[PDB]
Design an enzyme around this catalytic site. Structure first.
Site, PDB file in Angstrom:
ATOM      1  N   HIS B  41       0.788  -1.221   0.000  1.00 47.69           N
ATOM      2  CA  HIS B  41       0.000   0.000   0.000  1.00 47.69           C
ATOM      3  C   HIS B  41       0.828   1.284   0.000  1.00 47.69           C
ATOM      4  O   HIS B  41       0.258   2.367  -0.009  1.00 47.69           O
ATOM      5  CB  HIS B  41      -1.151   0.008   1.022  1.00 47.69           C
ATOM      6  CG  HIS B  41      -0.763   0.285   2.429  1.00 47.69           C
ATOM      7  ND1 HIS B  41      -0.456   1.546   2.890  1.00 47.69           N
ATOM      8  CD2 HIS B  41      -0.686  -0.538   3.493  1.00 47.69           C
ATOM      9  CE1 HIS B  41      -0.180   1.482   4.183  1.00 47.69           C
ATOM     10  NE2 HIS B  41      -0.343   0.234   4.579  1.00 47.69           N
ATOM     11  N   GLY B 143       2.236   6.734   9.062  1.00 47.47           N
ATOM     12  CA  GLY B 143       3.614   6.659   8.662  1.00 47.47           C
ATOM     13  C   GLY B 143       4.424   5.536   9.293  1.00 47.47           C
ATOM     14  O   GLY B 143       5.577   5.346   8.906  1.00 47.47           O
ATOM     15  N   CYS B 145       3.664   2.347   9.059  1.00 47.83           N
ATOM     16  CA  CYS B 145       3.568   1.123   8.275  1.00 47.83           C
ATOM     17  C   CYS B 145       4.941   0.712   7.763  1.00 47.83           C
ATOM     18  O   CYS B 145       5.777   1.550   7.416  1.00 47.83           O
ATOM     19  CB  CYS B 145       2.570   1.270   7.138  1.00 47.83           C
ATOM     20  SG  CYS B 145       0.902   1.512   7.736  1.00 47.83           S
TER      21      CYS B 145
END
EC number: 3.4.19.12
Lengths: 305, 305
Positions: B41, B143, B145
């Protein structure tokens, strides 16, 4: 979101950990520039710890009696000195991994990360607070002495603790990196006992702010209070008195949440008087006091290093 | 002595963290050898997350659309591929800090350390468990991830988790390093909700052993029980059923303490039925379930890395 007891990344400190052996005693040392810092009781056997005269015991130690190992490579000791309760071992090689650093003497109620080590090798990392009675509640086995506590601000490691002793109560005492003990403790195996383990009120309030930010809000009530009224309850529960300086320090969290400091104090007053009724806050069934207001802002805003 | 929730030293993982930017989205990647792993993603804006077709969105991405930065130095992307829910970005430089490593898919109930990162930079480290409902209870802001979870055995880092999503309930879901989600979760912003958050029974028992080793013993009672009788109570309290394999895994702790496994189960049964009566165990007012039996032995015996 989510709020966890979080330690600093430990890589910068891992690169400073060495093993220090003197005779049959092995503990950890901290290698910064061309100096290795370690507890002076590295010169003691367990039998010497009951009434050591460190100046006398040190007479019989020479540079070559201090074996210092960084991983599998030996460092050469070219001088040694006692400063307070630490030894400074001058070595012939500056640590190539030395970070930007400072030595700071923290105040009771402040927090730090501990890198627990054995034989100069890291075992794990966890967050601690300097308790109001100048102990810490750590995890330290035989051989962990010399493990250090620290904070990181961007690229600078502020070393604040070196571990020296465990009391019979199972709590932990130590020095700053200048070798001065926190609190009244000494590096002797004696009857020394910690005083009252008071709760760090400003930290509890900070954690209640962290809870609200992260969705736990059931404890917010309709009441307010005053500093003097709240402190009558703090005293009963062995909480540190809350001061105006504490109120000021909670200002940023109060602004972020829109909950006045004294309104949060009234929520805490109710939690103290009535308990949690089997409920939890941020996954805890007790009022947590090892997060400072700065810690809460740091974690909630994603500060990096 | 003392027992703390302790994370692994994070230095070896810190050296693998990079920043990955694709268009306006920035998250973290893991640089091992000449590959950077990151959540697929990274190719999505927040608006794309409601119904992404990752194969279609990826068509419009070329190697040069993935900006990879290690500290302040840019890496050159020479290939990319999607594997399950992660991207593998081939770079032209092998990470000089690559540790010995393995990718492992952990079982529910196992624990690991998370190095929370933002923009490729470490923020902090903490210990987590993979919950029986395949979520974790972490600390992850926008942020974060691509931050990873891992265990260390001596010199080998076993990566087991990569963070992808936060559910509306505030719990956290992610993949192994092959890109397969733990549990039934997907990388889409949808109505997906976690199932029952069952308690990891074997871990609670391990922590009760840790408590006895470290001096907390008030909960030891005069009773014993059987697996079937205990499990009638476990079911009531949403505890995982205890199995013979669990009993076997507690064998070493039982030998060290001389407390039979089923005797400790009887102590736990009483704690479940009667509560803690305002008492604490290892500084907690709830029954802690994020220490495995291995974790307890590790910490109590001072294993280093």
């Amino acid at each position: 979101s989510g709020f966890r007891k979080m330690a600093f990344p430990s890589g910068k400190v891992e690169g400073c950990m060495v093993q220090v052996t003197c005779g049959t005693t092995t503990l950890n040392g901290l290698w910064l520039d061309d100096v290795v810092y370690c507890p002076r009781h590295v010169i003691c056997t367990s039998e010497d710890m009951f009434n050591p005269n460190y100046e006398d015991l040190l007479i019989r130690k020479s540079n070559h009696n201090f074996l210092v190992q960084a991983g599998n490579v030996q460092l050469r000791v070219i001088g040694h000195s006692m400063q307070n309760c630490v030894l400074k071992l001058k070595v012939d090689t500056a640590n190539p991994k030395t970070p930007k650093y400072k030595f700071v003497r923290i105040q009771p109620g402040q927090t730090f990360s501990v890198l627990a080590c054995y034989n100069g090798s890291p075992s794990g990392v966890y967050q601690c607070a300097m308790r109001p009675n100048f102990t810490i509640k750590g995890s330290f086995l035989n051989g962990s002495c010399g493990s250090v506590g620290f904070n990181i601000d961007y690229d600078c490691v502020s070393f604040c603790y070196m571990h020296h002793m465990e009391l019979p109560t199972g709590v932990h005492v130590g020095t700053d990196l200048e070798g001065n003990f926190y609190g009244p403790f000494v590096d002797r195996q004696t009857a020394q006992a910690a005083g009252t383990d008071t709760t760090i009120t400003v930290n509890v309030l900070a954690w209640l702010y962290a809870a609200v930010i992260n969705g736990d809000r059931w404890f917010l009530n309709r009441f307010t209070t005053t500093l003097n009224d709240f402190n009558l309850v703090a005293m009963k529960y062995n909480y540190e008195p809350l001061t105006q300086d504490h109120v000021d320090i909670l200002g940023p969290l109060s602004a972020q949440t829109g909950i006045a400091v004294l309104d949060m104090c009234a929520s805490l007053k109710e939690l103290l008087q009535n308990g949690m009724n089997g409920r939890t806050i941020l996954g805890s069934a007790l009022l947590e006091d090892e997060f400072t207001p700065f810690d809460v802002v740091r974690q909630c805003s994603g500060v990096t290093f």
